[PDB]
């Protein structure tokens, strides 16, 4: 397995507090906001974040690392949406809440090019410490 998320092109609904979208693919899973490795949107309707894998890949695993210092509850009631190279949805999963600072999803070789994480409660900022996307097997 290799983490092909690293340094892929990212974007998000908006940015607050220097929480750039790229911070979720910098290879640093520290969720303490002041360690400067956690994304942050404004209070959007909805807040979302997206990664472009640059071409279609066989996806083995997705790992999402939450913020940990404060407001950890914000990463809850959300959707993970995977799209093909033509921007059509190929997979959706709804998440009620995280119990630990992270969630792992096996994708069993699902082919996709883009991954969006989008909150279903409007007004809530999205903050991610790290989103890792594994291919290989």
Residues near Ca ion (CB under 5 A) are 23, 26, 28, 37, 130
CA–CA dist 43, 32 (Å, integer) = 20
Residue closest to 28 by CA, chosen among 37, 36, 19: 37
For the bound state, the minimum distance from the C-beta of residue 128 to Ca ion, rounded and expressed in Å, comes to 8
Cβ-based nearer residue to Ca ion, 9 or 58 = 9
Residue nearest to Ca ion (CB): 37
Q: Could you tell me the smallest distance in angstroms from the CB atom of residue 129 to Ca ion? A: 5
Smallest gap, in angstroms, from Cβ of residue 59 to Ca ion? 20
Residues 6+ apart with CB under 8 A from 100: none
Closer to Ca ion by Cβ: residue 44 or 130:
130
Which of 23, 126 has the CB closer to Ca ion? Answer: 23
* Beta carbon nearer to Ca ion, 50 or 130: 130
Comparing CA positions, the residue from 109, 111, 105 lying closest to residue 131 is: 105
We find the least distance from the C-beta atom of residue 52 to Ca ion, in angstroms, to be 17
């Amino acid at each position: 397995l290799s983490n092909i998320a690293l340094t892929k092109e990212t974007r998000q609904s908006s940015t607050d507090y220097n929480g750039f979208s790229r911070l979720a693919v910098d290879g640093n899973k520290n969720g303490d906001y002041g360690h400067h490795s956690v994304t942050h949107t404004k209070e959007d309707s909805p807040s979302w974040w997206e990664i472009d894998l640059a071409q279609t890949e066989e996806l083995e695993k997705l790992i999402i690392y939450n913020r940990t210092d404060a407001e950890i509850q914000r990463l809850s009631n959300f959707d993970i949406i995977i799209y093909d190279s033509n921007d059509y949805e190929v997979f959706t999963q709804h998440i009620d809440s995280l119990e630990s600072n992270n969630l792992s999803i096996d994708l069993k070789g699902l082919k996709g090019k883009k991954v969006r994480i989008s909150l279903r409660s409007a007004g809530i900022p999205l903050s991610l410490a790290e989103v890792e996307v594994y291919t290989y097997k």
